[PDB]
Amino acid sequence: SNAMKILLRNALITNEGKTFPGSVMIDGAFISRIIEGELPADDNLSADEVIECSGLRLFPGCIDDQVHFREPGLTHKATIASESRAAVAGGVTSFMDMPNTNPPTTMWERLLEKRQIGADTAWANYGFFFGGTNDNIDEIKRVDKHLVPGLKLFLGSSTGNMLVDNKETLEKIFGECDLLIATHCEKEEIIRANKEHYKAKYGNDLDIHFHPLIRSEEACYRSSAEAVELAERMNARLHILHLSTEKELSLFRNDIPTAQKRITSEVCVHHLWFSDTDYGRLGNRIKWNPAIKKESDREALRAAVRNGRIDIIATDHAPHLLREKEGSCLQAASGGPLVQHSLLALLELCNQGIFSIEEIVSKTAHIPATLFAIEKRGYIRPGYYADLVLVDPSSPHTVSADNILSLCGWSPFEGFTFSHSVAYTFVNGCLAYAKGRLAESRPTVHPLFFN
Numbered sequence: 040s041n042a043m044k045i046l047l048r049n050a051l052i053t054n055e056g057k058t059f060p061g062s063v064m065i066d067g068a069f070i071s072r073i074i075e076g077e078l079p080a081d082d083n084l085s086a087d088e089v090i091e092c093s094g095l096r097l098f099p100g101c102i103d104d105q106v107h108f109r110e111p112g113l114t115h116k117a118t119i120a121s122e123s124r125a126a127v128a129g130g131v132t133s134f135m136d137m138p139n140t141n142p143p144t145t146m147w148e149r150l151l152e153k154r155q156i157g158a159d160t161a162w163a164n165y166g167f168f169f170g171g172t173n174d175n176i177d178e179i180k181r182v183d184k185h186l187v188p189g190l191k192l193f194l195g196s197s198t199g200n201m202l203v204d205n206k207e208t209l210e211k212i213f214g215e216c217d218l219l220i221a222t223h224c225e226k227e228e229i230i231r232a233n234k235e236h237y238k239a240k241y242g243n244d245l246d247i248h249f250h251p252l253i254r255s256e257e258a259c260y261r262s263s264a265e266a267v268e269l270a271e272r273m274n275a276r277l278h279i280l281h282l283s284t285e286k287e288l289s290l291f292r293n294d295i296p297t298a299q300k301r302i303t304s305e306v307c308v309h310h311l312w313f314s315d316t317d318y319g320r321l322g323n324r325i326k327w328n329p330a331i332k333k334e335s336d337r338e339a340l341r342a343a344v345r346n347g348r349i350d351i352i353a354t355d356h357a358p359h360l361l362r363e364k365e366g367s368c369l370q371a372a373s374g375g376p377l378v379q380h381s382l383l384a385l386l387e388l389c390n391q392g393i394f395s396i397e398e399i400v401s402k403t404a405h406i407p408a409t410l411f412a413i414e415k416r417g418y419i420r421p422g423y424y425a426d427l428v429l430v431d432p433s434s435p436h437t438v439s440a441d442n443i444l445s446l447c448g449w450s451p452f453e454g455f456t457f458s459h460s461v462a463y464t465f466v467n468g469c470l471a472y473a474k475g476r477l478a479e480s481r482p483t484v485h486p487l488f489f490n
Protein backbone atom coordinates (compact mmCIF):
# COMPACT_ATOMS: atom_id res chain seq x y z
CA SER A 40 0.00 0.00 0.00
CA ASN A 41 1.08 3.61 -0.57
CA ALA A 42 1.09 5.84 2.57
CA MET A 43 3.07 8.75 1.17
CA LYS A 44 2.00 12.06 -0.29
CA ILE A 45 3.26 11.89 -3.84
CA LEU A 46 3.19 14.91 -6.12
CA LEU A 47 2.93 14.43 -9.85
CA ARG A 48 4.33 17.80 -10.64
CA ASN A 49 3.54 19.99 -13.70
CA ALA A 50 2.02 17.42 -16.02
CA LEU A 51 -0.33 18.15 -18.92
CA ILE A 52 -3.57 16.81 -17.47
CA THR A 53 -6.52 15.54 -19.50
CA ASN A 54 -9.74 15.05 -17.54
CA GLU A 55 -13.45 15.53 -18.23
CA GLY A 56 -13.14 17.16 -21.65
CA LYS A 57 -10.34 19.57 -20.64
CA THR A 58 -6.60 19.49 -21.17
CA PHE A 59 -4.54 21.80 -18.94
CA PRO A 60 -1.13 22.12 -17.24
CA GLY A 61 -1.41 20.95 -13.67
CA SER A 62 -0.18 18.85 -10.79
CA VAL A 63 -1.86 16.02 -8.95
CA MET A 64 -1.31 15.20 -5.31
CA ILE A 65 -1.71 11.55 -4.28
CA ASP A 66 -2.32 10.85 -0.60
CA GLY A 67 -2.01 7.14 0.13
CA ALA A 68 -4.39 5.26 -2.21
CA PHE A 69 -6.37 8.37 -3.22
CA ILE A 70 -6.19 11.54 -5.28
CA SER A 71 -6.27 14.34 -2.76
CA ARG A 72 -5.78 17.44 -4.91
CA ILE A 73 -5.56 18.72 -8.48
CA ILE A 74 -3.57 21.95 -8.70
CA GLU A 75 -4.05 23.84 -11.95
CA GLY A 76 -1.10 25.56 -13.61
CA GLU A 77 2.67 25.30 -13.33
CA LEU A 78 4.01 25.12 -9.77
CA PRO A 79 6.95 27.53 -9.42
CA ALA A 80 10.48 26.09 -9.20
CA ASP A 81 10.78 25.84 -5.40
CA ASP A 82 7.25 24.67 -4.66
CA ASN A 83 6.44 21.00 -3.95
CA LEU A 84 3.38 21.50 -1.69
CA SER A 85 5.20 19.59 1.11
CA ALA A 86 5.03 16.28 -0.79
CA ASP A 87 6.90 13.28 0.65
CA GLU A 88 7.93 12.39 -2.87
CA VAL A 89 7.91 14.26 -6.16
CA ILE A 90 7.76 12.95 -9.70
CA GLU A 91 8.66 15.64 -12.22
CA CYS A 92 6.10 15.38 -15.02
CA SER A 93 7.01 18.33 -17.26
CA GLY A 94 6.54 17.13 -20.85
CA LEU A 95 4.32 14.20 -19.80
CA ARG A 96 0.59 13.78 -20.24
CA LEU A 97 -1.41 12.62 -17.21
CA PHE A 98 -4.68 10.63 -17.63
CA PRO A 99 -6.88 8.50 -15.37
CA GLY A 100 -5.83 4.85 -15.93
CA CYS A 101 -7.77 3.01 -18.66
CA ILE A 102 -10.62 0.79 -17.51
CA ASP A 103 -10.95 -2.12 -19.92
CA ASP A 104 -14.42 -3.76 -20.03
CA GLN A 105 -13.31 -6.85 -21.97
CA VAL A 106 -10.24 -9.03 -21.47
CA HIS A 107 -9.65 -12.77 -21.48
CA PHE A 108 -6.82 -13.54 -19.08
CA ARG A 109 -7.19 -17.34 -19.61
CA GLU A 110 -7.31 -18.34 -15.93
CA PRO A 111 -8.44 -20.77 -14.72
CA GLY A 112 -7.69 -23.58 -17.10
CA LEU A 113 -6.09 -22.07 -20.20
CA THR A 114 -2.89 -20.87 -18.48
CA HIS A 115 -0.47 -22.03 -21.16
CA LYS A 116 -1.80 -18.98 -23.04
CA ALA A 117 -1.76 -16.42 -20.20
CA THR A 118 -2.57 -15.82 -16.53
CA ILE A 119 -4.23 -13.04 -14.53
CA ALA A 120 -0.70 -12.25 -13.19
CA SER A 121 1.02 -12.20 -16.60
CA GLU A 122 -1.62 -10.17 -18.44
CA SER A 123 -2.40 -7.68 -15.67
CA ARG A 124 1.35 -6.87 -15.68
CA ALA A 125 1.06 -6.31 -19.45
CA ALA A 126 -2.01 -4.16 -18.74
CA VAL A 127 -0.27 -1.81 -16.28
CA ALA A 128 2.62 -1.43 -18.74
CA GLY A 129 -0.03 -0.19 -21.23
CA GLY A 130 -1.62 2.29 -18.75
CA VAL A 131 -4.64 0.02 -18.06
CA THR A 132 -5.31 0.07 -14.31
CA SER A 133 -8.64 -1.83 -14.16
CA PHE A 134 -9.90 -4.79 -16.23
CA MET A 135 -13.07 -6.88 -16.55
CA ASP A 136 -12.27 -10.51 -17.42
CA MET A 137 -14.72 -12.68 -19.37
CA PRO A 138 -16.33 -15.97 -18.23
CA ASN A 139 -15.03 -18.26 -21.06
CA THR A 140 -12.37 -19.84 -18.87
CA ASN A 141 -12.06 -23.57 -17.91
CA PRO A 142 -14.20 -23.92 -15.86
CA PRO A 143 -16.38 -21.05 -17.08
CA THR A 144 -17.54 -18.43 -14.61
CA THR A 145 -21.20 -19.56 -14.64
CA MET A 146 -21.74 -20.14 -10.94
CA TRP A 147 -21.16 -18.07 -7.86
CA GLU A 148 -18.38 -20.33 -6.54
CA ARG A 149 -16.38 -19.67 -9.72
CA LEU A 150 -16.75 -15.93 -9.49
CA LEU A 151 -15.59 -15.91 -5.83
CA GLU A 152 -12.63 -18.06 -6.93
CA LYS A 153 -11.58 -15.58 -9.66
CA ARG A 154 -11.89 -12.73 -7.14
CA GLN A 155 -9.45 -14.61 -4.87
CA ILE A 156 -7.02 -15.09 -7.81
CA GLY A 157 -7.28 -11.35 -8.46
CA ALA A 158 -6.58 -10.50 -4.82
CA ASP A 159 -3.59 -12.89 -4.70
CA THR A 160 -2.02 -12.22 -8.14
CA ALA A 161 -3.42 -9.25 -10.18
CA TRP A 162 -1.34 -6.15 -10.83
CA ALA A 163 -4.43 -4.11 -11.74
CA ASN A 164 -7.89 -3.67 -10.20
CA TYR A 165 -10.15 -6.50 -11.21
CA GLY A 166 -13.68 -7.50 -12.09
CA PHE A 167 -15.30 -10.57 -13.65
CA PHE A 168 -18.41 -10.85 -15.82
CA PHE A 169 -20.77 -13.62 -14.80
CA GLY A 170 -21.52 -16.06 -17.65
CA GLY A 171 -25.01 -17.06 -18.80
CA THR A 172 -25.69 -20.51 -20.28
CA ASN A 173 -28.76 -22.34 -21.56
CA ASP A 174 -29.04 -23.91 -18.09
CA ASN A 175 -27.97 -21.55 -15.25
CA ILE A 176 -30.79 -19.06 -14.82
CA ASP A 177 -31.02 -19.85 -11.09
CA GLU A 178 -27.33 -18.92 -10.69
CA ILE A 179 -27.86 -15.63 -12.53
CA LYS A 180 -30.71 -14.59 -10.17
CA ARG A 181 -28.41 -15.19 -7.13
CA VAL A 182 -25.57 -12.99 -8.50
CA ASP A 183 -24.83 -10.09 -6.08
CA LYS A 184 -24.90 -7.19 -8.60
CA HIS A 185 -22.36 -5.20 -6.57
CA LEU A 186 -19.83 -7.99 -7.24
CA VAL A 187 -19.95 -8.22 -11.07
CA PRO A 188 -20.08 -5.65 -13.92
CA GLY A 189 -22.93 -7.65 -15.48
CA LEU A 190 -23.76 -10.90 -17.29
CA LYS A 191 -21.97 -11.95 -20.49
CA LEU A 192 -23.83 -13.99 -23.12
CA PHE A 193 -22.16 -15.44 -26.21
CA LEU A 194 -24.87 -15.33 -28.90
CA GLY A 195 -22.22 -16.57 -31.37
CA SER A 196 -18.54 -17.61 -31.67
CA SER A 197 -18.79 -19.97 -28.65
CA THR A 198 -19.83 -23.64 -28.99
CA GLY A 199 -22.12 -25.93 -27.02
CA ASN A 200 -22.41 -25.00 -23.35
CA MET A 201 -21.27 -21.38 -23.66
CA LEU A 202 -23.32 -20.64 -26.80
CA VAL A 203 -26.67 -19.26 -25.70
CA ASP A 204 -28.96 -20.22 -28.56
CA ASN A 205 -32.03 -21.44 -26.62
CA LYS A 206 -34.70 -18.87 -27.51
CA GLU A 207 -36.82 -19.55 -24.44
CA THR A 208 -33.62 -19.13 -22.40
CA LEU A 209 -32.79 -15.74 -24.01
CA GLU A 210 -36.35 -14.48 -23.51
CA LYS A 211 -36.15 -15.69 -19.90
CA ILE A 212 -32.82 -14.00 -19.19
CA PHE A 213 -33.80 -10.69 -20.79
CA GLY A 214 -37.23 -10.72 -19.16
CA GLU A 215 -36.30 -12.00 -15.68
CA CYS A 216 -32.69 -11.09 -14.85
CA ASP A 217 -32.03 -7.62 -13.48
CA LEU A 218 -28.50 -6.86 -14.54
CA LEU A 219 -26.58 -5.37 -17.36
CA ILE A 220 -26.33 -7.96 -20.17
CA ALA A 221 -23.23 -7.77 -22.36
CA THR A 222 -23.47 -9.70 -25.64
CA HIS A 223 -21.20 -11.10 -28.32
CA CYS A 224 -23.37 -10.81 -31.45
CA GLU A 225 -22.70 -13.09 -34.48
CA LYS A 226 -25.47 -15.17 -36.06
CA GLU A 227 -24.10 -18.71 -36.39
CA GLU A 228 -26.78 -19.78 -38.92
CA ILE A 229 -25.51 -17.13 -41.34
CA ILE A 230 -21.84 -17.98 -40.72
CA ARG A 231 -22.61 -21.64 -41.53
CA ALA A 232 -24.42 -20.70 -44.77
CA ASN A 233 -21.36 -18.64 -45.82
CA LYS A 234 -18.89 -21.41 -44.79
CA GLU A 235 -20.83 -23.82 -47.00
CA HIS A 236 -20.72 -21.43 -50.00
CA TYR A 237 -17.01 -20.70 -49.69
CA LYS A 238 -15.89 -24.28 -48.95
CA ALA A 239 -17.96 -25.61 -51.87
CA LYS A 240 -16.71 -22.96 -54.33
CA TYR A 241 -13.06 -22.52 -53.20
CA GLY A 242 -12.20 -25.69 -51.19
CA ASN A 243 -10.97 -26.55 -47.66
CA ASP A 244 -7.78 -24.49 -47.39
CA LEU A 245 -9.42 -21.07 -47.07
CA ASP A 246 -6.94 -18.44 -45.94
CA ILE A 247 -7.45 -15.34 -43.78
CA HIS A 248 -9.10 -13.32 -46.57
CA PHE A 249 -12.23 -15.51 -46.30
CA HIS A 250 -12.61 -14.71 -42.60
CA PRO A 251 -14.68 -11.50 -42.91
CA LEU A 252 -16.64 -13.08 -45.79
CA ILE A 253 -17.64 -16.04 -43.61
CA ARG A 254 -18.12 -14.15 -40.32
CA SER A 255 -19.90 -11.51 -42.39
CA GLU A 256 -21.36 -8.07 -41.85
CA GLU A 257 -24.87 -9.58 -42.08
CA ALA A 258 -24.02 -12.28 -39.49
CA CYS A 259 -23.03 -9.48 -37.03
CA TYR A 260 -25.94 -7.19 -37.88
CA ARG A 261 -28.60 -9.90 -37.76
CA SER A 262 -27.51 -11.04 -34.28
CA SER A 263 -27.26 -7.45 -32.93
CA ALA A 264 -30.64 -6.46 -34.43
CA GLU A 265 -32.27 -9.49 -32.73
CA ALA A 266 -30.64 -8.71 -29.40
CA VAL A 267 -31.76 -5.05 -29.62
CA GLU A 268 -35.37 -6.07 -30.39
CA LEU A 269 -35.44 -8.47 -27.46
CA ALA A 270 -33.98 -5.80 -25.14
CA GLU A 271 -36.54 -3.26 -26.36
CA ARG A 272 -39.36 -5.82 -25.78
CA MET A 273 -38.27 -6.33 -22.15
CA ASN A 274 -36.85 -2.86 -21.46
CA ALA A 275 -33.60 -4.72 -20.65
CA ARG A 276 -30.16 -3.19 -20.14
CA LEU A 277 -28.10 -4.46 -23.09
CA HIS A 278 -24.45 -3.67 -23.90
CA ILE A 279 -23.31 -4.93 -27.31
CA LEU A 280 -19.59 -5.75 -27.43
CA HIS A 281 -16.90 -5.20 -30.07
CA LEU A 282 -18.80 -3.54 -32.87
CA SER A 283 -17.10 -4.24 -36.21
CA THR A 284 -19.46 -2.85 -38.85
CA GLU A 285 -20.87 0.42 -40.11
CA LYS A 286 -24.23 -1.33 -40.56
CA GLU A 287 -24.64 -2.08 -36.84
CA LEU A 288 -24.31 1.61 -35.93
CA SER A 289 -27.88 2.23 -37.10
CA LEU A 290 -29.05 0.18 -34.03
CA PHE A 291 -27.57 2.71 -31.56
CA ARG A 292 -28.37 6.31 -30.69
CA ASN A 293 -26.39 9.44 -30.03
CA ASP A 294 -29.29 11.78 -29.21
CA ILE A 295 -28.99 11.09 -25.45
CA PRO A 296 -26.04 10.63 -23.07
CA THR A 297 -24.59 7.15 -22.27
CA ALA A 298 -25.99 7.34 -18.72
CA GLN A 299 -29.58 7.48 -20.11
CA LYS A 300 -29.21 4.66 -22.66
CA ARG A 301 -30.73 1.24 -22.03
CA ILE A 302 -28.77 -0.06 -25.02
CA THR A 303 -25.06 0.75 -25.22
CA SER A 304 -22.08 -0.34 -27.31
CA GLU A 305 -18.35 -0.93 -27.09
CA VAL A 306 -15.66 -0.94 -29.79
CA CYS A 307 -12.20 -2.46 -29.47
CA VAL A 308 -8.91 -0.87 -30.52
CA HIS A 309 -8.11 -3.46 -33.20
CA HIS A 310 -11.37 -2.59 -35.02
CA LEU A 311 -10.36 1.11 -34.82
CA TRP A 312 -6.82 0.42 -36.02
CA PHE A 313 -6.80 -2.42 -38.55
CA SER A 314 -8.79 -3.06 -41.74
CA ASP A 315 -8.96 -6.00 -44.14
CA THR A 316 -6.23 -4.28 -46.20
CA ASP A 317 -3.90 -5.49 -43.38
CA TYR A 318 -4.66 -9.22 -43.88
CA GLY A 319 -2.02 -9.51 -46.64
CA ARG A 320 0.76 -8.39 -44.28
CA LEU A 321 -0.33 -9.73 -40.85
CA GLY A 322 -2.38 -12.81 -41.75
CA ASN A 323 -3.72 -14.75 -38.74
CA ARG A 324 -2.06 -12.28 -36.34
CA ILE A 325 -5.17 -10.09 -36.92
CA LYS A 326 -7.70 -12.93 -36.95
CA TRP A 327 -10.44 -11.96 -34.47
CA ASN A 328 -14.14 -12.56 -33.88
CA PRO A 329 -15.97 -10.46 -34.98
CA ALA A 330 -13.66 -10.22 -38.01
CA ILE A 331 -11.73 -7.11 -38.99
CA LYS A 332 -13.74 -5.87 -41.97
CA LYS A 333 -13.64 -2.98 -44.52
CA GLU A 334 -11.74 0.31 -44.42
CA SER A 335 -15.20 1.96 -44.59
CA ASP A 336 -16.24 0.06 -41.44
CA ARG A 337 -13.13 1.24 -39.59
CA GLU A 338 -13.95 4.80 -40.79
CA ALA A 339 -17.55 4.54 -39.55
CA LEU A 340 -16.51 3.18 -36.15
CA ARG A 341 -13.99 6.04 -35.72
CA ALA A 342 -16.78 8.53 -36.60
CA ALA A 343 -19.13 6.83 -34.12
CA VAL A 344 -16.56 7.21 -31.33
CA ARG A 345 -16.49 10.91 -32.14
CA ASN A 346 -20.28 11.26 -32.45
CA GLY A 347 -21.29 9.10 -29.46
CA ARG A 348 -23.01 6.14 -31.12
CA ILE A 349 -20.16 4.09 -29.61
CA ASP A 350 -20.09 4.50 -25.82
CA ILE A 351 -16.69 3.08 -24.84
CA ILE A 352 -13.42 1.69 -26.11
CA ALA A 353 -11.85 -1.55 -24.89
CA THR A 354 -9.38 -4.17 -26.13
CA ASP A 355 -10.79 -7.71 -26.09
CA HIS A 356 -7.21 -8.75 -25.12
CA ALA A 357 -7.30 -12.50 -25.83
CA PRO A 358 -3.90 -14.26 -25.98
CA HIS A 359 -3.22 -17.54 -27.73
CA LEU A 360 0.20 -19.10 -28.33
CA LEU A 361 1.49 -18.80 -31.90
CA ARG A 362 1.04 -22.58 -32.45
CA GLU A 363 -2.70 -21.96 -31.95
CA LYS A 364 -2.68 -19.07 -34.49
CA GLU A 365 -1.42 -21.33 -37.32
CA GLY A 366 -3.43 -22.52 -40.38
CA SER A 367 -6.56 -21.66 -42.42
CA CYS A 368 -9.32 -19.24 -41.31
CA LEU A 369 -11.03 -22.54 -40.31
CA GLN A 370 -8.22 -23.91 -38.10
CA ALA A 371 -6.49 -20.83 -36.63
CA ALA A 372 -7.61 -19.35 -33.31
CA SER A 373 -9.29 -15.93 -33.26
CA GLY A 374 -7.91 -13.46 -30.77
CA GLY A 375 -4.64 -11.86 -29.78
CA PRO A 376 -3.01 -9.71 -27.11
CA LEU A 377 -3.45 -5.90 -27.20
CA VAL A 378 -3.48 -4.35 -23.71
CA GLN A 379 0.20 -3.36 -23.50
CA HIS A 380 -0.08 -1.19 -26.63
CA SER A 381 -3.75 -0.23 -27.15
CA LEU A 382 -3.43 3.18 -25.42
CA LEU A 383 -0.29 3.94 -27.50
CA ALA A 384 -2.27 3.02 -30.64
CA LEU A 385 -5.15 5.32 -29.69
CA LEU A 386 -2.68 8.13 -28.96
CA GLU A 387 -1.09 7.54 -32.37
CA LEU A 388 -4.56 8.11 -33.94
CA CYS A 389 -4.84 11.35 -31.94
CA ASN A 390 -1.55 12.53 -33.58
CA GLN A 391 -3.39 12.00 -36.86
CA GLY A 392 -6.49 13.98 -35.90
CA ILE A 393 -8.69 10.87 -35.88
CA PHE A 394 -9.60 11.42 -32.20
CA SER A 395 -8.94 14.09 -29.59
CA ILE A 396 -7.00 13.21 -26.46
CA GLU A 397 -10.12 14.31 -24.58
CA GLU A 398 -12.30 11.70 -26.41
CA ILE A 399 -9.77 8.92 -25.78
CA VAL A 400 -9.76 9.63 -22.03
CA SER A 401 -13.56 9.82 -21.97
CA LYS A 402 -13.96 6.56 -23.90
CA THR A 403 -11.29 4.54 -22.05
CA ALA A 404 -11.78 5.84 -18.50
CA HIS A 405 -14.71 8.20 -17.78
CA ILE A 406 -17.49 6.39 -19.63
CA PRO A 407 -16.52 2.82 -18.70
CA ALA A 408 -16.68 3.98 -15.04
CA THR A 409 -20.08 5.66 -15.64
CA LEU A 410 -21.57 2.85 -17.72
CA PHE A 411 -20.65 0.06 -15.24
CA ALA A 412 -21.20 2.31 -12.19
CA ILE A 413 -17.67 1.73 -10.86
CA GLU A 414 -17.04 3.40 -7.51
CA LYS A 415 -14.25 5.99 -7.23
CA ARG A 416 -12.32 5.20 -10.42
CA GLY A 417 -12.09 6.53 -14.00
CA TYR A 418 -11.72 10.24 -13.20
CA ILE A 419 -9.06 12.55 -11.83
CA ARG A 420 -11.21 13.83 -8.93
CA PRO A 421 -10.42 14.38 -5.26
CA GLY A 422 -11.41 11.31 -3.22
CA TYR A 423 -11.08 8.89 -6.14
CA TYR A 424 -8.48 6.09 -6.27
CA ALA A 425 -5.11 7.16 -7.64
CA ASP A 426 -5.25 4.95 -10.76
CA LEU A 427 -3.20 7.10 -13.12
CA VAL A 428 -1.03 6.91 -16.22
CA LEU A 429 1.70 9.30 -17.36
CA VAL A 430 2.55 9.09 -21.07
CA ASP A 431 5.53 10.64 -22.88
CA PRO A 432 4.48 12.04 -26.30
CA SER A 433 8.08 12.52 -27.45
CA SER A 434 9.64 9.16 -26.57
CA PRO A 435 8.88 6.56 -29.27
CA HIS A 436 8.28 2.94 -28.37
CA THR A 437 9.05 0.07 -30.78
CA VAL A 438 7.27 -3.21 -30.10
CA SER A 439 9.65 -6.19 -30.11
CA ALA A 440 10.02 -9.77 -28.84
CA ASP A 441 12.24 -8.40 -26.11
CA ASN A 442 9.76 -5.90 -24.67
CA ILE A 443 6.44 -7.81 -25.14
CA LEU A 444 5.03 -8.71 -21.68
CA SER A 445 2.04 -10.96 -22.55
CA LEU A 446 2.78 -14.58 -21.79
CA CYS A 447 2.04 -15.53 -25.43
CA GLY A 448 5.09 -13.57 -26.48
CA TRP A 449 3.83 -11.90 -29.70
CA SER A 450 1.89 -8.77 -30.64
CA PRO A 451 -0.16 -7.74 -33.70
CA PHE A 452 1.85 -4.48 -33.38
CA GLU A 453 5.24 -6.24 -33.56
CA GLY A 454 7.74 -4.00 -35.40
CA PHE A 455 5.57 -0.87 -35.14
CA THR A 456 7.01 2.31 -33.58
CA PHE A 457 4.51 4.39 -31.56
CA SER A 458 5.29 8.07 -31.03
CA HIS A 459 4.21 7.76 -27.37
CA SER A 460 5.41 5.60 -24.51
CA VAL A 461 4.04 4.89 -21.04
CA ALA A 462 6.30 6.68 -18.55
CA TYR A 463 4.58 5.73 -15.25
CA THR A 464 1.48 3.78 -14.09
CA PHE A 465 -0.01 4.12 -10.60
CA VAL A 466 -2.57 1.65 -9.26
CA ASN A 467 -4.22 2.84 -6.01
CA GLY A 468 -1.32 5.30 -5.53
CA CYS A 469 1.30 2.52 -5.90
CA LEU A 470 3.81 2.97 -8.66
CA ALA A 471 3.38 -0.27 -10.71
CA TYR A 472 5.46 0.54 -13.77
CA ALA A 473 8.12 3.14 -14.52
CA LYS A 474 10.41 3.72 -17.47
CA GLY A 475 9.98 0.36 -19.17
CA ARG A 476 10.05 -1.79 -16.04
CA LEU A 477 7.44 -3.33 -13.75
CA ALA A 478 7.77 -2.39 -10.07
CA GLU A 479 9.67 -4.68 -7.65
CA SER A 480 6.50 -5.04 -5.58
CA ARG A 481 2.98 -5.73 -6.79
CA PRO A 482 0.75 -2.69 -6.23
CA THR A 483 -2.21 -2.79 -3.89
CA VAL A 484 -5.20 -3.95 -5.96
CA HIS A 485 -8.96 -4.03 -5.24
CA PRO A 486 -12.02 -5.63 -6.76
CA LEU A 487 -13.89 -3.06 -8.79
CA PHE A 488 -17.07 -2.15 -6.88
CA PHE A 489 -20.25 -1.76 -8.92
CA ASN A 490 -23.12 0.52 -7.83
Ligand SMILES: C[As](C)(=O)[O-]
Pocket residue numbers: 078079080081093
Ligand atom coordinates in the same frame (compact mmCIF):
# COMPACT_ATOMS: atom_id res chain seq x y z
C1 LIG B 1 11.39 25.58 -13.50
AS1 LIG B 1 11.13 23.89 -12.54
C2 LIG B 1 12.61 23.59 -11.27
O1 LIG B 1 9.63 23.95 -11.68
O2 LIG B 1 11.09 22.59 -13.69
Ligand SMILES: C[As](C)(=O)[O-]
Pocket residue numbers: 107139193195196197223328329357373
Ligand atom coordinates in the same frame (compact mmCIF):
# COMPACT_ATOMS: atom_id res chain seq x y z
C1 LIG C 1 -13.83 -14.78 -26.98
AS1 LIG C 1 -15.33 -15.17 -28.17
C2 LIG C 1 -15.91 -17.01 -27.82
O1 LIG C 1 -16.56 -14.00 -27.77
O2 LIG C 1 -14.80 -14.98 -29.82
Ligand SMILES: [Cl-]
Pocket residue numbers: 376377378379380449450451452
Ligand atom coordinates in the same frame (compact mmCIF):
# COMPACT_ATOMS: atom_id res chain seq x y z
CL1 LIG D 1 -0.02 -6.19 -27.94
Ligand SMILES: [Zn+2]
Pocket residue numbers: 196223280281328329
Ligand atom coordinates in the same frame (compact mmCIF):
# COMPACT_ATOMS: atom_id res chain seq x y z
ZN1 LIG E 1 -16.55 -11.80 -28.12
Ligand SMILES: [Zn+2]
Pocket residue numbers: 105106107137355357
Ligand atom coordinates in the same frame (compact mmCIF):
# COMPACT_ATOMS: atom_id res chain seq x y z
ZN1 LIG F 1 -14.21 -10.94 -25.85
